[PDB]
Design a protein around this nucleic acid. Structure first.
Lengths: 69, 67
DNA sequence: GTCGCCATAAATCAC
DNA sequence: ACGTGATTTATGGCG
C-alpha cells in the first residue's frame, strides 16, 4: 500500500483527466517523482484504476467530488 | 476469457526461455504439440516473457543507481 | 505476408 | 470476504 499523499496525487490527476486518463511517458515520469514511486507502479495504478473505477459509479462520483482540485 | 497455464506448462516454457529467448518456427511447433498450447499462445508467451526480462533488469538497474 | 515490440485490457494472484 | 498492488494471458498497431 502507497502513502496517503501518493494516492492523493494519483487520484487528483486521474479525476482531472477523465476524458483521456492515459498519462504520457513524461507525465508518468513526473507523477513517479512527485509520489516517490516507480513509473511501472504509476503504470499499474492507472491500468487498475481505469478498469475498476467504472465498476461502482456511485463510488467514482464520490471520489470525483473528494479529489476535485 | 484468459486461461491460466498449468504449473507444468509454465516450468517447461521457462526452461526453454533460459536456453533461448527467441524461438524458431520449428521449436515453436515442437512445444505447441508437447504442451497442448497453440503456436499463437507459445508466440505470445515468449513475447510477454521478453517484456518481463526487460522490466526485471530495469528494476535492478534502478536499485544499482540508488546506491 | 510474418514476427517482434509496445502499450493496454482483462482476469487472477497474494496478502 | 474483499480491496489493493502486482502479475499473468491476450489484443491491435505498426515497423
Amino acid at each position: 500500500n502507497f502513502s496517503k499523499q501518493a494516492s492523493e496525487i494519483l487520484n487528483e490527476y486521474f479525476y482531472s483527466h477523465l476524458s483521456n486518463p492515459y498519462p504520457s511517458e513524461e507525465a508518468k515520469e513526473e507523477l513517479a517523482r512527485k509520489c516517490g514511486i516507480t513509473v511501472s507502479q504509476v503504470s499499474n495504478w492507472f491500468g487498475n484504476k481505469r478498469i475498476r473505477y467504472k465498476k461502482n459509479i456511485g463510488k467514482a462520483q464520490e471520489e470525483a467530488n473528494l479529489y476535485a482540485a | 476469457g484468459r486461461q491460466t497455464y498449468t504449473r507444468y506448462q509454465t516450468l517447461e516454457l521457462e526452461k526453454e526461455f533460459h536456453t533461448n529467448h527467441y524461438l524458431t518456427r520449428r521449436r515453436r511447433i515442437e512445444m505447441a504439440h508437447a504442451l497442448s498450447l497453440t503456436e499463437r499462445q507459445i508466440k505470445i508467451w515468449f513475447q510477454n516473457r521478453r517484456m518481463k526480462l526487460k522490466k526485471e533488469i530495469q528494476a535492478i538497474k534502478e536499485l544499482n543507481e540508488q546506491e
